[PDB]
Every structure is written in C-alpha cells, then in structure tokens.
C-alpha cells in the first residue's frame, strides 16, 4: 500500500523580482515576476507515501533533515495530502545537482503530482508548486517564465514566455560571495517598487520580442537595484549586500565600460548573478578572475521545465 | 587700496541629512537638516580684495588652485562682491587642519564679511554661507545646529540648538575608507525620503531634550540609510557605498551587539562616521582596529562656531 513518484526541476533566476506577498497563506504576490530557468542547477526528488510509514521523513543529499529543516517540506506534504485526501506519511528524498529550496519544492510538487495521480496540467502544477514557494511555481517552466500575480489561488500561476529561442543565446555567470514582510509592511520605498514593476515587465516583453539585449539588461539591473533599495527604507532598515556584492557590482560596471554588455542581479543573499550573451561569457570570467577565485565563478545557460517520472 | 579679513570655521557632520535642492540658484533645500560641528577638522581662510590684483587667486594648503578647483570660490567671490558693490579681484588663502570644502566656504564667508565690513549677524552670515554650500551655513554655529529650509533666501538659514552641553558628552569616530539632483528628479523613493524627515527632526529634538543617546542614534542611523536608499531608485540607479563602507556598517552593528551604543552615518563618499558617547570611543577604536589600520580611525568631539579675525 504505497504510492510513489519522481520529478526533476531546475532553478530559476528572477529578472523582474518577486518581492512581497499579498496573501501569506496562499502565497499570492504583490506583483508579477519574470525569471530565466537555468540548466546548471536542479533538484531531483522522489516521494513515497506508504501506509506503513510512522512519520514524515525528508532526506536531502543523503542527510536526514531535522524538524526545522523539514518545515517547508512538511507543510507542503500536508497541503497536497489534504487536497488528495491522503492519510499516509511520506518519505521525501531530494538530491541537489550544482534557489535550491525553490527547485526542490518544484520537484516535490511534480513528484507528488505523479505519486497521487493528480494528473495536473502545467498551469495547475504551477499553482500547486506556488503553495510551497513562489519561485518554485516558475520552475515548472523552462526558459523565460512569468508568474502572473492574479487575484486568487486560481489565477496566480506561471507560464512560459516564447522567445523565438533567444533564451538559448543567453547565459548567467554566478559570482559566489522576515525581511520581505518587514519591507512590505514598514518601508516608505515599497510603493515606489510597486509603481515601477509593470513598466519593467512590459519593456522586458518588448525587449524579448526584438531580442534587444542591452534593453533587457538595463531594465532587469535597475529592477533588482530598486528591490534592494526598498530594504534601506524598512523599519529597522537593512541590506542583503555584503562587501563582496558591491565589489562584484562595480566590476560588472567596469566590464560594460570595456564593451562587454552584461548586467547584474541579486537576491536575498550576497551572491551576484551576471546576465551576458553566450559569446562573452568566457571573457567575463577571465576579467572577474582578477578579483575572485575559480571556485567563485560558475556559468549557466537556459534550462528546461519540470520533468516527471513514473517510479 | 585693499581690504582683508580672516575666519576659522569647523566642519560639521549631518545627522539629519541635507538631501536635494528646491532652488539651485539660491541653494534652498527640499528639507531641513541637523548637524554636529566638530573640533578636529577646520579651515582657516584669509581673503584680500585689492585694486592692484589682476585676477582672482585661490591658494589651498599652499598650492595654487586651477580654474576647476577655483570654481566654487570664484562664484562665491562674485556673489559677495555684487552684494557689496566691490569691483576688486581677490586672493583667497585657505589652510585645512585635519566636508573641508564646506568648512572652507564657511570660513571664506566670514573672512569676506570681515574684509568688506558687512557686519553680518550670525543669521545673515549663515544665509551668506548658504550661497556657497548648504553644509557651510551650519558651520557658522557650534555643537548641534539646524538649517531651517525656509521658503526663500531670507528664511533659509541655520541656528544653534541648545543641548544643555550634551554635545560635550558625545564624539564621532571617522572610519577612513550630480547624484543629488538626479535623485530628486528621477528617484521613485525620493518622496518617501521627504515624508520622513520632519518626524526624524522632531525626535532628535526630543532626544536632545532628554539626552537620550540610543534614541538619537537610532533616528540618525535610519535617516542616513533612508538617504542612501533613494539613490538605488534613481534613473540610472547608483550607490555612494564602497565594499569597505558595508564592512564598517556591519562592524558597528556588531559593536552594538556587544553592548557599545554607537551608530553610523555616511555622506556622498565611502567613508563611515560613527556617533558614540565619549566614554566608549577608545573601546570602539580598539574593536575596529581588528579590520582597519590606525591611519583609518580618527576621533572628533564637538566644535565651536565660526571665529572672525580682523587682519
């Protein structure tokens, strides 16, 4: 008496940021977001629901996860079990291949979809993954994907953005180096963030249509910096940046000054991701090898959407 | 046929920032600001107006200044000459003792006041110095000073803030490591800056009245960070910070975590200034000597207002 399933999901980098929740219970965002799914980073997850299991068990990269490390997986298992009326405890085994939490929750959503026979469409699998993490709902799709904020659980989900395979000409170079809710609630800059998101989304779409890289890069770099500005207006104010983040951002500006179009974006931690055309990736690595070690510069290209496996 | 005068003016650190101009010609600010005048840093300036001079000459620390280095001094000389109906070229000799541009313009304003016999009140000398630089108008005064934005040339000036000599219990530790107009005009965060200034000023005044140091420190640290957030919303966005600025800010937070009340503020360059009570200054220097050299840690205490000298 057991049900099992497996999925592989790739991480994604938000180019137009998901920043702030309108609804905490359902993970409905304050604004729509847009990402690029990446080939280099992914999670493979297997789930087993078995009447003989006595508790939920989460193993990540061979290591048994403790309660706090299992908290998001357990809450997702409860959600999908309640949706399926399944009364069994589960064993989740994930292996990261190297944002990972998000790819992991996307993979778990697909694995549970398989195991419980939910037969979900891509849209409804995105809606399910959304309940685990917002970024996870975009990793259901490959290449460029947009999470549409929606007004509700039914209308908030992600879809792929057809680029005419422009995504296959791009690359990301990773430079290895409570706050969101605080910012929504207390930051005097949050409204300015909200007022600029839709214009940014529109111009990304116009840039994708014309394959205009400098336009794409300028928009997404300013979008990321606008997100980071908001935390300096929160009460109390904070930054996600580390000294190395600033060094890396300044070096990307230097790179552009030498005629390499490239553009940086950051998330909720100090690392810096650089968008560049495939042509210039190695030149950028060499330039940044002046101030950072080989182990700190990691390339990635466009990746696929979620892959489901019957067990 | 010559007229001469001399003044000494001390620099000041803005605790509630002057950020943005309402009027560029008259230097009327978008908001009121509040500073502490410091003992350690000052400029002494002598001016001579002489019918025999053939051009304006500016010597700074013994070195003849070129045209671009003389631009602000020359514009100030023209302003004060037009106000006095004086047709003579001038020789300005300034010596920095070690923000310096601002202390230098305050000192020049006092020296011209003496030389041309303007017999200005402190208020009117502040109004004159304001035409050279906004910060200069506060350095007319010692200790705590507030530049009231006013609506006009007549109403925009600075005044000392009586503290019951609380300023003599404080200290600043300096850690040595176009954008303003761009931010006013393009930043989606500038209105949030404006909406929070007056509340900050009110609480500084309440803190001074009760000599409440943690309250003063919390307000001014958040005020500075709010100013810096606005530049990340400018078009194009930018930061004044350098990697070392972030390291220093993080170390100040660590210092507080160990029970040393202290609070950081930054201006338009990478250096970091730390407000602390006199009692703890040396402890802070020792703590920061872990990551910075002796030449990078410079203490200062409360300084006096402008001093005028007949020549």
Author numbering:
A (entry chain A), B (entry chain A): 0 to 97, 104 to 182, 193 to 326
Text taken from the publication that reported this structure:
In the mevalonate pathway, the mevalonate diphosphate decarboxylase (MDD, EC: 4.1.1.33) is a rate-limiting enzyme, suggesting that inhibition of MDD could eliminate the products of the mevalonate pathway and accordingly shut down bacterial growth. The γ-phosphate group of ATP is transferred to MVAPP to make the 3′-phosphate-MVAPP intermediate, which is then subjected to dephosphorylation and decarboxylation to produce IPP. In this study, we utilized MDD from Enterococcus faecalis V583 (MDDEF), a VRE strain, and investigated the enzyme from structural, functional and biophysical points of view. Our present results suggest that the substrate-binding mechanism of MDDs involves programmed conformational rearrangements in and around the active site, including movements of the β10-α4 loop, the phosphate-binding loop, and three helices, α1, α2, and α4.
The investigation of the structural details of the MDDEF mechanism was aided by the discovery of crystallization conditions under which the introduction of substrates and cofactors by soaking resulted in activity in the crystal. These MDDEF crystals were grown at a high ammonium sulfate concentration (1.6 M)19 but subjected to buffer exchange into PEG3350 solutions before soaking with ligands. The apo form of MDDEF (MDDEF-SO42−) has almost identical secondary structure elements compared with other MDDs. In the present structural study, the positions of two loops were determined in the ligand-bound MDDEF structures but not in apo-MDDEF. Other MVAPP-bound MDDs have stabilized phosphate-binding loops possibly due to crystal contacts directly involving this loop or the C-terminal insertion covering the corresponding β-strands in eukaryotic MDDs. In contrast to all other published structures, in the MDDEF structures, there is no crystal contact in the regions described above, which should allow the flexible loops to take up unrestricted conformations. In the physical mechanism, the phosphate-binding loop and the β10-α4 loop may be initially dynamic or disordered in an apo structure (left).
